[PDB]
Design a protein around this motif. Structure first.
Motif, short mmCIF file in Angstrom:
data_model
loop_
_atom_site.label_atom_id
_atom_site.label_comp_id
_atom_site.label_asym_id
_atom_site.label_seq_id
_atom_site.Cartn_x
_atom_site.Cartn_y
_atom_site.Cartn_z
N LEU B 232 0.89 -1.02 -0.04
CA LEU B 232 0.03 -0.01 0.11
C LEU B 232 0.58 1.13 0.07
O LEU B 232 0.58 2.38 -0.70
CB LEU B 232 -0.91 0.04 1.18
N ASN B 233 1.87 1.18 0.79
CA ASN B 233 2.96 2.38 0.85
C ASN B 233 3.46 2.82 -0.66
O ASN B 233 3.32 3.88 -1.12
CB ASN B 233 3.77 2.16 1.74
N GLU B 234 3.75 1.68 -1.35
CA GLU B 234 4.46 1.82 -2.73
C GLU B 234 3.47 2.19 -3.95
O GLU B 234 3.66 2.93 -4.58
CB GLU B 234 5.43 0.87 -3.07
N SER B 235 2.18 1.73 -3.65
CA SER B 235 1.20 1.98 -4.70
C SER B 235 0.22 2.84 -4.20
O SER B 235 -0.93 2.49 -4.56
CB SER B 235 0.75 0.66 -5.34
N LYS B 236 0.36 3.70 -3.37
CA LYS B 236 -0.58 4.49 -2.87
C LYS B 236 -1.54 5.21 -4.00
O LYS B 236 -2.63 5.39 -4.02
CB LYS B 236 -0.01 5.70 -1.73
N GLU B 237 -0.67 5.93 -4.88
CA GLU B 237 -1.10 6.54 -5.77
C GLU B 237 -2.21 5.77 -6.88
O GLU B 237 -3.23 6.33 -7.36
CB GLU B 237 0.00 7.38 -6.64
N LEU B 238 -1.51 4.68 -7.11
CA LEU B 238 -2.47 3.61 -7.88
C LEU B 238 -3.51 3.17 -7.18
O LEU B 238 -4.71 3.09 -7.91
CB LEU B 238 -1.32 2.74 -8.38
N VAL B 239 -3.47 2.66 -6.03
CA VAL B 239 -4.61 2.12 -5.36
C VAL B 239 -5.59 3.22 -5.17
O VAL B 239 -6.73 2.91 -5.31
CB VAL B 239 -4.16 1.66 -3.91
N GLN B 240 -5.47 4.64 -5.04
CA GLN B 240 -6.28 5.64 -4.83
C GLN B 240 -7.16 5.84 -6.25
O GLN B 240 -7.90 6.12 -6.21
CB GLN B 240 -5.53 6.91 -4.75
N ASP B 241 -6.19 5.59 -7.25
CA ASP B 241 -6.84 5.96 -8.90
C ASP B 241 -7.74 4.92 -8.98
O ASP B 241 -8.82 5.01 -9.64
CB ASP B 241 -5.64 6.06 -10.04
N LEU B 242 -7.37 3.64 -8.61
CA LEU B 242 -8.43 2.50 -8.71
C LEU B 242 -9.69 2.64 -8.04
O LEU B 242 -10.80 2.25 -8.51
CB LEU B 242 -7.55 1.00 -8.51
N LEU B 243 -9.64 3.11 -6.79
CA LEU B 243 -10.71 3.29 -5.98
C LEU B 243 -11.40 4.45 -6.66
O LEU B 243 -12.83 4.51 -6.39
CB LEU B 243 -10.36 3.52 -4.45
N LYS B 244 -11.11 5.56 -7.29
CA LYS B 244 -11.75 6.59 -7.83
C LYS B 244 -12.37 6.05 -8.98
O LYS B 244 -13.16 6.95 -9.41
CB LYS B 244 -10.80 7.90 -7.96
N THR B 245 -11.83 5.03 -9.61
CA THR B 245 -12.38 4.67 -11.12
C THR B 245 -13.29 3.50 -10.86
O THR B 245 -14.22 3.39 -11.86
CB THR B 245 -11.17 4.14 -12.00
N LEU B 246 -13.26 2.44 -9.88
CA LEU B 246 -14.32 1.47 -9.76
C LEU B 246 -15.87 1.78 -10.08
O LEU B 246 -16.70 1.14 -10.72
CB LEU B 246 -14.07 0.71 -8.63
N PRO B 247 -16.32 2.85 -9.38
CA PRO B 247 -17.81 3.08 -9.33
C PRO B 247 -18.25 3.37 -10.67
O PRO B 247 -19.63 3.43 -10.84
CB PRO B 247 -18.10 3.99 -8.37
N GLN B 248 -17.49 3.55 -11.68
CA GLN B 248 -17.73 4.16 -12.97
C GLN B 248 -17.35 3.08 -14.12
O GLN B 248 -17.70 3.29 -15.52
CB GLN B 248 -17.11 5.58 -13.27
N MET B 249 -16.96 2.09 -13.79
CA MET B 249 -16.48 0.96 -14.62
C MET B 249 -17.56 0.13 -15.37
O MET B 249 -17.50 -0.44 -16.13
CB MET B 249 -15.17 0.17 -14.23
N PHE B 250 -18.69 0.09 -14.45
CA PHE B 250 -19.84 -1.12 -14.72
C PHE B 250 -20.90 -0.48 -14.73
O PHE B 250 -22.26 -1.01 -14.42
CB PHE B 250 -19.84 -1.99 -13.54
N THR B 251 -21.15 1.08 -15.16
CA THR B 251 -22.38 1.76 -15.21
C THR B 251 -23.50 1.09 -16.19
O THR B 251 -24.64 1.05 -15.65
CB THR B 251 -22.19 3.23 -15.57
N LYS B 252 -23.17 0.54 -17.27
CA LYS B 252 -23.92 0.07 -18.43
C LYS B 252 -23.91 -1.36 -18.56
O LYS B 252 -23.97 -1.76 -19.62
CB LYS B 252 -23.48 0.92 -19.63
#
Ligand SMILES: [Zn+2]
Ligand SMILES: [Zn+2]
Lengths: 707, 729, 135
Positions: B232-252
């Protein structure tokens, strides 16, 4: 002139027959040493024919249905034409009601015996390019392959569809342009997947096959971020490479999405398949990949099972109508032997090198995407070749990149050769140089070749070639036939037969018997006097061709890896006469101060020391510097201004090479060695039973005795 | 105090006005002062029967209820280079051992004399504290201390996308990303699934996380050897971007089927090498692949008591996770029947816990939205232990024979706890295997060996000492009615699956009958001892709880989750839910605990759960542990409408009133001062909604009036009348 | 040619840091802890032990033992190079705190450097004795 006749008929019709006068009697037709056969190039380029944009006028006989051609008798008063094949009298279509003597349709002019029709009736499909990339290779090779792909991607039409499959231990089907995530479908490279299974597991353009214009950028960013297969390779092991499963997924993906349409499955491997179906070698580095010596002693347990897997994929893709290319660059072998059916049954390419990071591969790969005077690729797709003959002519079969459609008819002969039992063949991919070999059987005569294919522009096209050859006048049967012999074409057509029987297993015994039989029928000699044997100018070169053929790497496979044999045979079974002759017998040139460059004999009596040679085998361009010129060059005479003539000499063969070194599709290897160099072996091995003189002596001894 | 006798038919007001305190064992003053905190370790009988015959006569179950990993205010830690344990039963030295030779101590569980190592020995912290935590030496770990690993598994079917749960869960992970327990060794991973399984690679060398799909449902595998469980320490920025993206990947999305089974197998394979916490979010019935479950018609109020899992798949899988130190927590956000009776097995046998949010929807159900928000805040921030094991030792002659709670029992009664969470409660039932004629005191000791989120092997130990008695009367005198109700509730849940819900209810009623019938024969009205004056009331409340009620519209998943809460929650919250606390709050004052510096905190008297206590003229607060429900009468005073609610009349109170406004009044001060004192006693923040009205269609407030009657359940006075007809039959 | 790395204090066999990944371990981790107990001030500071199909390689520096296990066909040359990369980093970061600690695995967070250095050796792209004797 028979020579002018053979030349002008290859330029106009893309055909070259073994015999240009055909036997009219059953006795001669059965006693034919070299069969009546044709080297046929269906899409040969020529001085700008007019593309004719209307449907071909067909004969109104349900059986015949031959295309209107310059051999048909036309009555311009009664608006009738008579079929030259079945004699059916035909009313002209409504559109031809105004044709006249002083202005007649193109398909009737003798210069349009070969002619191309454009048929525009249904919506045209775009081209499909599916990249199947291996990631089990060094970074230098992977980066170089990535650079070659981005160059090919930069040449595609904007409407072309592209997909990307990467594989190593696993197989990833990438869904392009999913925006913000870049996703892929991962599969085990250990078990096979059917087209129906793959359709169910995955869910005009797809999510996986997208237009270049709409995706090229996302691809360019993906193609540039690819990396090695992340699975570690333990010490003394080969990488786990799932080439067989990767191909079956690539084949299965297009079979359930875009069947019966042009598509290239371009597969780039950096080693042999080591896992899953189609595996060529185990993952133990200590166990070497099978050699021909190992094939002979049954010490190759993967060959038979791996071949059967790729033969199933090749026939699935040829049935669907798709093309498979193999681009195999590695230091060791890669399995071209077991995979050869995929680019052979389809019209696919087979490229082979030591590394994708070479000028050899990079230039060979861009030759694939060569465009014409209209910016269009020189590839054709989904070709269907139908051949119609007079009632006296029957088709034995075809040899070359094709697959039978198994369409029976009266033209189909019982005695079948190669891919026979049909008058129709499918060629999933073809180029202006794609050459087939059709073998005939007699039971003027005329043959009609009809090739319907998908042009790279999307247009549906039909190429029609109607030729005619005289029947042998019975009062001079063997005399007229003998003068119509095409020794160049017959040698390649007989080589075609030999390679096919060898690659689908004595073959040399058959080659020798037919050569002796040809001597005893068309040669002049007294019995039991070998000194008295002579051949006419028509047959004199044929023994020299057989001599090089039976010693060639196409039939003497030991001293080559099994992959090198399949590669050589792959390119020989598709080439035209001019290039096929060069394969069998290399052409040699000489460069010395005493006169301009000249064609010399392929004999050790030409290896002069004060001379520079330029040998052209189809696969290699070599420049040999004899012991004398090699010393003048090691000394430094070239750089001296006193010896600018010694610069014209050492660069004249390098000047003439580059011209042909840029035309041939598989860019031939360029070699520069001298006397004492370790690369002069390729010259000494192609040079010289024993030698040609000893070969001819034995041939004359056997030709003048018993039959 | 008093050892008096109570006629429940005359009292009917026997519930005190102050909170119930746990009984003090009849122990010497110096012994009891050292005893373990009753919140952590308590027994149903503070006076242990000397023989099994005595225990059988009392008709009361003997057992323990423990909350061993509860958050503490002060925890002594011993870092001794050697941990003094008995050489025979391995009992840790404790305040209730006996030093005779001063260099020799007698074990209080197996009576063996042990040598005190050269390392006033009775002044040692090991002897002065019943609750203590040790530093485990290298022999107490099978492997190096595992890092904290958090794998989240999200359902993203069409139904899951409609609920909108993914937005709050991802947003909660963002807000609490730095508060997850662990050091720099912390690992995190993500998996989504519908009809296929989706992994996510997280590499800094890439512009964005990559989504790897495994579509082979009958044969799942890990597609990548790396970058799936990332630091989590090394991939903090990437984990954050994935969390900000998940709710919008499956809208349709159009995927209506869910392959929950294969997704768990994949998640198990991913976490198998390390272990850790696996958070599964599911919103519907699993229908695709292994672990698929058949639909089942719901019951109605007319249905009789006619529970168990449909398949052993999720039980077999939990035992696989258990052997790999993997705990599975199940978040069920389903609006239709999802067969929690089967899915719940994934948490029961992996020391996880299930969380239920019936009919979750990001707009239509604002109650469940805030409930998931609060429960995720605690779930992600509370302390945690990994690869843990617990052992319960008791003095020779006593034997644990049944365990209750989320864990896996190994051989020799070893409790496997892949995770240990600070909100879990366990129950044990024991019996007298050998007569305790020798000793007059007995002890019980639980030892919790675990790995801290910092990578330290720790052992938390509690020891409870109790006296042994030899008469029926002394066993009744030391009865813990709440602990008895808690154990009976856990025992009835087992009876529900082993037999039926009918037999579970009968065994609860017969528990009060046989116990009181045994008391009556050992002494006209319904006479009970003072320690059991609340026994029929609490058992009646069990029979009206959602676990064991009958004539209700309770659905299948509803009842199963209530039983999961019985099996997994500590005693204090079982009682708060079963018998809620009722206070009148429209007239709070200053008789309270105005001791906490600058805050008054009124202490209104606890009312009994009867509508007869209510009044259409006032307002009443109900504390059910998890929720605070404020019922305001139709004819409430105008002073309470404006000075507390901020409203000018009853007809303008917002229908979903998610909480109280902090108005500028002393009225809205005392109530916010008393509420704040209630919700500060617990870790899971209890949402308070005043939605309760005379007509909100959310006045389940009246369901908690367990003393009153309905068309399907007896009243409290009728219950006593029913009891009396049997005690003297 | 796989992995198993343990760092311990030689005087008492106190574990300092380790790194293990399976997807057995119980038998060889035991042996690695028998070895840590036998090592003292007379033991060879650089040695290689043969365990049938497996092989232990260790070095001893600053009273701290750096030990690796792998299949015997892993290059002995690379095993000591890997242990040298660990010693220089561990001595630089915690070398002066080793003689003071008492908890087992007081430097767990060295887990990271062990594993980022580990992958740099298990990817192709002194004394010899039998371990059963020493035990
Ligand atoms: Zn016709
Ligand atoms: Zn003991």
């Amino acid at each position: 002139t028979y020579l002018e006749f053979i030349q002008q008929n290859e330029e106009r019709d893309g055909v070259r027959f073994s015999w240009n006068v055909w036997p009219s009697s059953r006795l001669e037709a059965t006693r034919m040493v070299v069969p009546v056969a044709a080297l046929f190039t269906p899409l040969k380029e020529r001085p700008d024919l007019p593309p004719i944009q209307y449907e071909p006028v067909l004969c109104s006989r349900t059986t015949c249905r031959a295309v209107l051609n310059p051999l048909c008798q036309v009555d311009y008063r009664a608006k009738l034409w008579a079929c030259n094949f079945c004699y059916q009298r035909n009313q002209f279509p409504p559109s031809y009601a105004g044709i006249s003597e002083l202005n007649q349709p193109a398909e009737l002019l003798p210069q349009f015996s070969s002619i191309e029709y454009v048929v525009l009736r249904g919506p045209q499909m775009p081209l499909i390019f599916l990249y199947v990339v291996d990631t089990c290779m060094e970074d230098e090779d992977l980066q170089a392959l990535k650079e070659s792909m981005q160059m090919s991607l930069s040449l595609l039409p904007p409407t072309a569809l592209v997909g990307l499959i990467t594989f190593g231990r696993m197989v990833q089907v990438h869904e392009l342009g999913c925006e913000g995530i870049s996703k892929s479908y991962v599969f085990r490279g250990t078990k096979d997947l059917s087209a129906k299974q793959l359709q169910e597991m995955l869910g005009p353009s797809n999510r996986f096959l997208q237009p270049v214009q709409k995706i090229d950028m996302n691809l360019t960013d993906l193609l540039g971020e690819l990396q090695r297969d992340p699975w570690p390779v333990p010490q003394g092991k080969r990488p786990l490479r799932s080439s067989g499963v990767a191909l079956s997924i690539a084949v299965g993906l297009l079979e359930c999405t875009f069947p019966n349409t042009g598509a290239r499955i371009m597969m780039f491997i950096g080693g042999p398949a080591t896992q899953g179906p189609g595996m060529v070698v185990g993952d133990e580095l200590k166990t070497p990949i099978r050699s021909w010596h190992d094939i002979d002693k049954d010490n190759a347990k993967y060959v038979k099972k791996g071949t059967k897997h790729f033969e199933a994929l090749a026939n699935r893709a040829a049935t669907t109508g798709h093309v498979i290319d193999i681009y195999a660059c590695a230091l060791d072998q890669t399995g071209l032997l077991e995979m050869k059916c995929c680019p052979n049954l389809t019209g696919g390419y087979m490229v082979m090198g030591d590394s994708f990071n070479t000028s050899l591969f990079k230039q060979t790969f861009q030759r694939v995407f060569t465009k014409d005077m209209h910016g269009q690729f020189k590839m054709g797709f989904g070709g269907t070749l139908e051949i119609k003959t007079s009632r006296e002519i029957k088709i034995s079969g075809a040899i070359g990149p094709c697959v039978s459609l198994n369409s029976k008819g009266p033209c189909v002969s019982e005695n079948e050769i190669g891919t026979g039992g049909t008058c129709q063949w499918k060629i999933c991919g073809l180029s202006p140089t794609t050459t087939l070999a059709i073998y005939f059987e007699v039971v003027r005569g005329a043959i009609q070749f009809v090739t319907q294919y998908q042009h790279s522009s999307g247009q549906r096209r039909i190429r029609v070639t109607t030729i005619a050859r005289n029947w042998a006048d019975a009062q001079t049967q063997i005399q007229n036939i003998a003068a119509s012999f095409d020794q160049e074409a017959a040698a390649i057509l007989m080589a075609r037969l030999a390679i096919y029987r060898a690659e689908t297993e004595d073959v040399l015994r058959w080659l020798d018997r037919q050569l002796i039989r040809l001597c005893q029928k068309f040669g002049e000699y007294h019995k039991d006097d070998p000194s008295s044997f002579r051949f006419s100018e028509t047959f004199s070169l044929y023994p020299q061709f057989m001599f090089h053929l039976r010693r060639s790497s196409f039939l003497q496979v030991f001293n080559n890896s099994p992959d090198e044999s399949s590669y050589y045979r792959h390119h020989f079974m598709r080439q035209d006469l001019t290039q096929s002759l060069i394969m069998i017998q290399p052409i040699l040139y000489a460069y010395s101060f005493s006169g301009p460059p000249e064609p010399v004999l392929l004999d050790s009596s030409s290896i002069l020391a004060d001379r520079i040679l330029l040998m052209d085998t189809f696969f290699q361009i070599l420049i040999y510097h004899g012991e004398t010129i090699a010393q003048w060059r090691k000394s430094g005479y070239q750089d001296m201004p006193e010896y600018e003539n010694f610069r014209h000499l050492l660069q004249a063969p390098v000047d003439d090479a580059q011209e042909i070194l840029h035309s041939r599709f598989p860019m031939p290897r360029y070699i520069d060695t001298e006397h004492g160099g370790s690369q002069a072996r390729f010259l000494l091995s192609k040079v010289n039973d024993v030698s040609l003189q000893v070969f001819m002596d034995h041939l004359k001894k056997l030709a003048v005795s018993s039959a | 105090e008093g050892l008096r006798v109570v006629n429940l038919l005359q009292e009917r007001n026997m519930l005190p006005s102050t909170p119930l305190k746990p009984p003090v064992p009849n122990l010497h003053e110096d012994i009891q002062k050292l005893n373990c905190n009753p919140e952590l370790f308590r027994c149903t009988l503070t006076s242990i029967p000397q023989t099994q015959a005595l225990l059988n006569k009392a008709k009361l179950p003997l057992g323990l209820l423990l909350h061993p990993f509860k958050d503490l205010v002060q925890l002594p830690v011993v870092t001794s280079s050697t941990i003094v344990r008995c050489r025979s039963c391995r009992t840790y030295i404790n305040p209730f051992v006996s030093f005779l030779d001063q260099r020799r101590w007698k074990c209080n569980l197996c009576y063996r004399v042990n040598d005190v190592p050269e390392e006033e020995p009775h002044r040692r912290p090991e002897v002065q504290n019943a609750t203590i935590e040790f530093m485990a030496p290298s022999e107490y770990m099978l492997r190096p201390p595992q890092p904290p690993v958090y794998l989240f598994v999200f359902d993203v079917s069409h139904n899951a996308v409609e609920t909108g749960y993914l937005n709050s869960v991802c947003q909660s992970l963002l807000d609490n990303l730095d508060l997850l327990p662990g050091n720099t060794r912390t690992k995190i991973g993500f998996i989504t699934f519908d009809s296929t399984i989706h992994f996510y690679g997280l590499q800094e060398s890439l512009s964005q996380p990559q989504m790897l799909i495994v579509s082979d449902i009958e044969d799942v595998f890990i597609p990548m050897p790396e970058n799936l469980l990332v630091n989590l320490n090394e991939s903090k920025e990437l984990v954050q971007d994935l969390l900000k993206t998940l709710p919008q990947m499956f809208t349709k999305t159009l995927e209506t089927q869910s392959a929950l089974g294969p997704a768990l197998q994949a998640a198990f394979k991913l976490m198998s090498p390390t272990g850790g916490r696996m958070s599964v979010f599911q919103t519907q019935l699993p229908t695709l692949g292994v672990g698929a479950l058949k639909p089942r018609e719901e019951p109605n109020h007319r249905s009789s008591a006619k529970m168990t899992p449909s398949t052993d798949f999720y039980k077999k899988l939990a035992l696989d996770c258990s052997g790999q130190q993997v705990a599975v927590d199940l978040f069920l956000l389903s609006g239709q029947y999802s067969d929690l009776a089967s899915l719940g097995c994934i948490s029961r046998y992996s020391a996880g816990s299930v969380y239920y949010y019936p009919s979750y929807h990001h707009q239509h159900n604002p109650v469940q939205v805030q409930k998931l928000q609060k429960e995720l805040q605690r779930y992600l921030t509370r302390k945690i232990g990994f690869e843990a094991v617990m052992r319960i030792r008791c003095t020779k002659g006593l034997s644990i024979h049944t365990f209750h709670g989320n864990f896996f029992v190994r051989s020799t009664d070893l409790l496997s706890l892949p995770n240990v969470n600070p909100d879990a409660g366990y129950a044990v039932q024991m019996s007298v295997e050998e007569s305790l004629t020798d000793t007059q005191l007995v002890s019980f000791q639980s030892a919790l060996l675990y790995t801290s989120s910092k990578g330290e092997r720790r052992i938390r130990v509690h020891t409870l000492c109790l006296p042994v008695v030899s008469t029926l009367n002394d066993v009744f005198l030391g009865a813990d009615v709440q602990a008895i109700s808690g154990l009976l509730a856990n025992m009835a849940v087992d009876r529900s699956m082993t037999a039926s819900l009918s037999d579970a209810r009968d065994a609860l009623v017969n528990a009060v009958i046989d116990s009181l019938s045994a008391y009556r024969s050992s002494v006209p009205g319904l006479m009970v001892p003072f320690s059991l004056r609340l026994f029929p009331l609490f058992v009646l409340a069990l029979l009206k709880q959602k676990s064991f009620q009958t004539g209700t519209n309770a659905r299948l998943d509803e009842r199963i989750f209530a039983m999961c809460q019985v099996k997994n929650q500590p005693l204090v919250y079982l009682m708060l839910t079963t018998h809620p606390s009722l206070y009148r709050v429209d007239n709070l004052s200053d008789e309270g605990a105005l001791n906490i510096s600058d805050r008054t905190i009124p202490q209104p008297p606890i009312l009994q759960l009867s509508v007869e206590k209510l009044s259409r003229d006032g307002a009443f607060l109900m504390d059910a542990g998890s929720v605070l429900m404020l019922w305001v009468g139709k004819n409430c005073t105008q002073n309470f409408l404006s000075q507390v609610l901020g409203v000018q009349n009853y007809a303008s109170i917002p229908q979903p009133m998610t909480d109280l406004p902090e108005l500028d009044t002393p009225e809205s001060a005392r109530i916010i001062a008393f509420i704040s004192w209630l919700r500060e006693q617990r870790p899971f923040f209890p949402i308070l909604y005043v939605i309760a009205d005379e007509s909100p269609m959310k006045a389940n407030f009246l369901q908690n009036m367990i003393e009153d009657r309905t068309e399907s359940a007896l009243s409290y006075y009728e219950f006593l009348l029913h009891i009396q007809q049997q005690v003297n039959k | 040619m796989v992995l198993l790395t343990m760092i311990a204090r030689v005087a008492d066999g106190l574990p300092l840091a380790a790194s293990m990944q399976e997807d057995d371990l119980q038998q060889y981790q035991s042996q690695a802890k028998q070895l840590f107990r036998k090592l003292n001030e007379q033991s060879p500071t650089r040695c290689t032990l043969e365990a049938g199909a497996m092989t232990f390689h260790y070095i001893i520096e600053q009273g701290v033992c750096y030990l690796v296990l792998c299949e015997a066909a892993f290059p002995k040359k690379l095993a000591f190079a890997y242990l040298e990369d660990l010693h220089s980093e561990f001595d630089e970061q915690h070398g002066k705190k080793v003689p003071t600690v008492s908890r087992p695995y007081s430097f767990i967070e060295f887990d990271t450097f062990i594993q980022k250095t580990k992958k740099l050796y298990i990817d192709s792209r002194i004394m010899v004795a039998n371990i059963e004797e020493v035990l």
